[PDB]
Each structure stands twice: as C-alpha cells, then as structure tokens.
Ligand binder design. Sequence first.
Ligand SMILES: CCCCCCCCCCCCCCCCCCCC(=O)NCCO
Ligand SMILES: [Cl-]
Length: 134
Amino acid sequence: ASLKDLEGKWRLMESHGFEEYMKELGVGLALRKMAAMAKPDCIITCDGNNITVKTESTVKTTVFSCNLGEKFDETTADGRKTETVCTFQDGALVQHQQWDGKESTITRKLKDGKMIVECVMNNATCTRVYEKVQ
Ligand SMILES: CCCCCCCCCCCCCCCCCCCC(=O)NCCO
Ligand SMILES: [Cl-]
C-alpha cells in the first residue's frame, strides 16, 4: 500500500463506533447526530509530500493541506484547534492531533480496494469504510 493509493474521491459506506469516538472528542449530541447522518465524501490529493484532505458534506466542508512530517495547525470539523502531524507508516497515512494536552490519531489505509479510516482517542475506536466514487 502507498500514499498515492489514497488519492481520489471517496464515499462513506460503513461506520462503527463513530458516536462514541465523537463523544470522547467532546462533540455535543446535536452535532453528533448531524455528523452521523450526513455521510460525506472525502477527497484526498497527494502531490508528492503535499497532502490535501477535503471532507465534504451538505452541512459542513473542511480541508487541510500539509507536508508529510511537518507539524501544522488544524481547525477540525468540530472546532478543535489542534497541532497535527501526518506521517506515512506501514502503508497508512497517520494523522496525529494534539490539543489541550489530549491526543487522537486517524489512520487511513487502502485495504482490498477500500479506504479504511481508523480513529482512536483514549479507549474509543471508530472504524469507517470508504469506497471510490466512479
Ligand atoms: C467525516 C467528517 C464529519 C462530517 C463533517 C461535519 C458535519 C457536521 C459539523 C460538525 C460535527 C463534527 C463531526 C466530527 C468532526 C471531526 C471528527 C473526526 C472526523 C474524521 O476525521 N472522520 C473520519 C472520516 O473522515
Ligand atoms: Cl484549518
């Protein structure tokens, strides 16, 4: 699996543990239900080391653009202001966020033609499965 393998337009097909993950993040109920219901597309572009992740929905669209391994300031879809580093490790794009002495990691990996997005914060894990839009 490679970084360029992640590039493209992706649609959410399956989600597990998302609500609990968002609660661990501190997302309130109203916002949680909105997030869970509006099921996005995630557009990723990989121009060399320069990685852009755009998450699009009818309710909110967020984008970050980073260089691999360089720390950057991210404003997340729920409004957290984090310091983030993306790395590439064992076939996965690893996005590590830190804010308020807390941390979360989001891993994106191509498995069997699908993008698997694993989100961890503390004891709360979320798995989200995306498929490539034709
Ligand atoms: C999928 C993005 C959430 C939908 C966009 C926000 C919609 C409503 C606005 C605010 C509600 C906040 C929802 C959770 C935001 C960030 C949690 C991590 C999302 C993520 O990377 N999730 C892994 C999949 O990319
Ligand atoms: Cl930002």
